[PDB]
Design a protein around this ligand. Structure first.
Ligand SMILES: O=C(NCCCNc1nc(Nc2cccc(CN3CCOCC3)c2)ncc1C1CC1)C1CCC1
Ligand SMILES: [Mg+2]
Ligand SMILES: [Mg+2]
Length: 269
């Protein structure tokens, strides 16, 4: 049982890991029933892990939204970094999908409405996330689909991007990267919309819209195919079909923009 401020956690209770972080369940040292997630360095990549946790603090401390994982506290020092975040009792969307295989359109709508709410804030603040994928989408139960709250997590790759500028850093998860990202081209906040389209497609079908055996294979596929058209099942509602075809466009200038996404009829209640 280690401590960080007025919080504690145990390294026995690993609830997530990536190349640049590990996350442990914990709680407030005084209100033991207030659970938290404590994100720590991954020591197999000490220097980059430390950098990325530092970056995440700077972003997340500016974002307060019911559909973004809350930062309760943090502690940054020369040789160590911890973030103390909201614990989401439903775990990640990746494990939920693995169990459920596919989600109903009604549940996709409820989840995507919340993702869209979070993206509204990011877009107004001029922040791009750059690593949206089911592993980084969290669920919390307060019960049914209509009560699951979803939260975007893992802002270590996120950056401010001025509205007249483009980003060029190669980062993210290849199977969810927009084509312009994985092909080492400039990109903007519409790269996140491709990622979101990919998540939605995966929720609907249980599979990736563009199958590949490796990252390099996927890049070659994008380079060689100047038009990208996902297969849409016949059972798909006409609004969800249109939304998926709008988000999963190869070329960012053609892709759905934020205003189109936020107002798309699929998201109407
Ligand atoms: O944060 C990441 N991935 C998401 C999973 C780990 N993180 C979290 N897990 C959780 N919750 C959680 C994760 C896995 C399992 C569970 C417990 N449930 C048990 C019952 O059935 C559902 C899962 C809960 N809440 C918040 C967080 C994030 C840091 C603020 C990345 C891994 C390096 C960063
Ligand atoms: Mg990020
Ligand atoms: Mg772009």
């Amino acid at each position: 049982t280690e401590t960080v401020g007025k919080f504690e956690f145990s390294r026995k209770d690993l609830i997530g890991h990536g190349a640049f972080a590990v996350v442990f369940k914990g709680r407030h040292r005084e209100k033991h029933d207030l659970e938290v997630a404590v994100k720590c360095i991954n020591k197999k990549n000490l220097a980059k892990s430390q950098t990325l946790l530092g970056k995440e603090i700077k972003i997340l401390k500016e974002l307060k939204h019911e559909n973004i994982v809350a930062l309760y506290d943090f502690q940054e020092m020369a040789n160590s970094v911890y973030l103390v975040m909201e614990y989401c009792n439903g775990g990640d969307l990746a494990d939920y999908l693995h169990a459920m295989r596919t989600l109903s359109e009604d549940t996709i709508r409820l989840f995507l409405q919340q993702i869209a709410g979070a993206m509204r804030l990011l877009h107004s603040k001029g922040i791009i996330h750059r690593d949206l994928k089911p592993q980084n989408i969290l669920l919390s139960n307060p019960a049914n689909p209509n009560s699951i709250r979803v939260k975007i997590a893992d802002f270590g790759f996120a950056r401010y991007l001025q509205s007249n500028m483009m980003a060029a850093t190669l980062c993210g998860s290849p199977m969810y990267m927009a084509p312009e990202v994985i092909m080492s081209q400039h990109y903007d906040g519409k790269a996140d919309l491709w990622s979101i389209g990919t998540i939605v497609y995966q929720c609907l079908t249980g599979k990736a819209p563009f199958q590949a055996s490796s990252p390099q294979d996927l890049r070659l596929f994008y380079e060689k195919n100047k038009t990208l058209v996902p297969t849409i099942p016949a059972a798909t509602s006409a609004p969800l079909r249109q939304l998926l075809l709008a988000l999963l466009q190869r070329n960012h200038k053609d892709r759905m923009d934020f205003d189109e996404f936020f107002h798309h009829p699929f998201l109407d209640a």
